[PDB]
Ligand SMILES: COc1ccccc1CN1C[C@@H](C(N)=O)CC1=O
């Protein structure tokens with residue numbers, strides 16, 4: 596689990612969105628595994644606006660943060676789960692690291708701010724849904 600709070604928005608994994616997230620929907624993209632809902636309280640996370648390929652992510656199944664090198668956002672094949680059939684997920688970045696389903700929502704950060712959130716895993720890889728292109732999150 597985990598979310599990003601920036602301005603009047605909450606960014607979550609689309610497959611983990613709650614009833615309140617869907618009742619306050621701003622934008623959702625199934626191909627990205629992202630959903631953004633509106634909030635009443637002001638968030639103060641900072642979104643990175645950069646092309647970093649190194650950062651640190653939080654892994655709840657190890658209660659640890661790990662430094663990683665990650666690929667640029669791209670269209671990657673993701674195996675079927677209970678939430679989606681096998682498909683290409685867009686705007687996904689991979690790194691070598693540990694990730695279990697409950698790790699979704701953990702933040703990946705670089706020196707500039709929040710880069711994305713854990714969205715995939717298995718086979719010793721971890722995948723993060725990028726949010727750096729969503730420039731409207733700041734206005
Ligand atoms: C071994 O499976 C995982 C490991 C870590 C994280 C997630 C999974 C399996 N996923 C992938 C998600 C997606 N983005 O399509 C939905 C889901 O349940």
Ligand SMILES: [Zn+2]
Pocket residue numbers: 643644645646647705706707708
């Ligand atoms: Zn950066």
